[PDB]
């Protein structure tokens, strides 16, 4: 018996600015796999899947230029809960409904995906610095439907 599954990926891009730090070329164009989940196991508004880790790696940082770094995220927001990213599918596949994608900083704080809600400021050390995040699905309806649940977002660095 086939199973109904919801899952997909989120793709992140950012500007390559030679500011206080330089963003790794790997981090500035990356795809994070969120997993596949049994659709029937989403049974209530607010159900969430496991947090999937991803990183933004900064190279060649100079704390003398800027003591701290933070990140904001921008994408098309879910209409039911605008603190989540709306999900989409490829043309050959159906889109899941009743879920959005949540991004959290390393303090476990969700970030509104409006391009102006920045993560907790992190102290920089000379050279390479790792900024850690997670992503997951969050149900926006009690009854969800199966399919692909992908998103595209941009990230924005703030050095202070």
Author numbering: 4 to 163
Copy text from the publication:
The FimA subunits of the pilus rod are single domain proteins of 16 kDa with an incomplete, immunoglobulin (IG)2-like fold that lacks the C-terminal β-strand (G-strand). In the structure of the pilus rod, the FimA subunits interact via inter-molecular donor strand complementation, in which the N-terminal extension of each subunit, termed the donor strand, inserts as a β-strand into the preceding subunit and completes its IG-like fold. In 2010, Sukumaran et al. discovered that the FimA proteins from the enteroinvasive pathogens E. coli, Shigella flexneri, and Salmonella enterica have a second function besides formation of homopolymeric pilus rods; soluble forms of FimA, independent of FimC, act as inhibitors of host cell apoptosis after pathogen internalization by stabilizing the interaction between hexokinase and the voltage-dependent anion channel (VDAC) on the surface of mitochondria.
FimAECO, FimASHI, and FimASAL were produced as reduced, insoluble proteins in the E. coli cytoplasm without their N-terminal signal sequences. All proteins were refolded in the absence of the chaperone FimC under oxidizing conditions to allow the formation of the single, invariant structural disulfide bond. The purified proteins were crystallized, and their X-ray structures were determined at 1.5, 0.89, and 1.69 Å resolution, respectively. All FimA orthologues crystallized as self-complemented monomers, and all structures strongly resembled the previously reported NMR structure of the FimAECO monomer. Specifically, all three FimA monomers showed nearly identical immunoglobulin-like folds, completed by intramolecular donor strand insertion in a parallel orientation relative to the C-terminal F-strand. The global folds and registers of parallel donor strand insertion in the X-ray structures of FimASHI and FimASAL were the same as those observed in FimAECO, and all three structures showed high surface complementarity between donor strand and the rest of the folded FimA domain. The only significant difference in the mode of donor strand insertion was found for FimASAL, where Ser6 instead of Val5 occupied the P5 pocket, which caused a more extended conformation of the FimASAL donor strand segment Ser6–Gly7–Gly8. The overall pairwise Cα RMSD values for the three X-ray structures were 0.30 Å for FimAECO/FimASHI (113 Cα atoms), 0.51 Å for FimAECO/FimASAL (154 Cα atoms), and 0.57 Å for FimASAL/FimASHI (110 Cα atoms), and the only minor conformational differences were restricted to loop segments 15–20, 37–45, and 89–97, and residues 51 and 81.
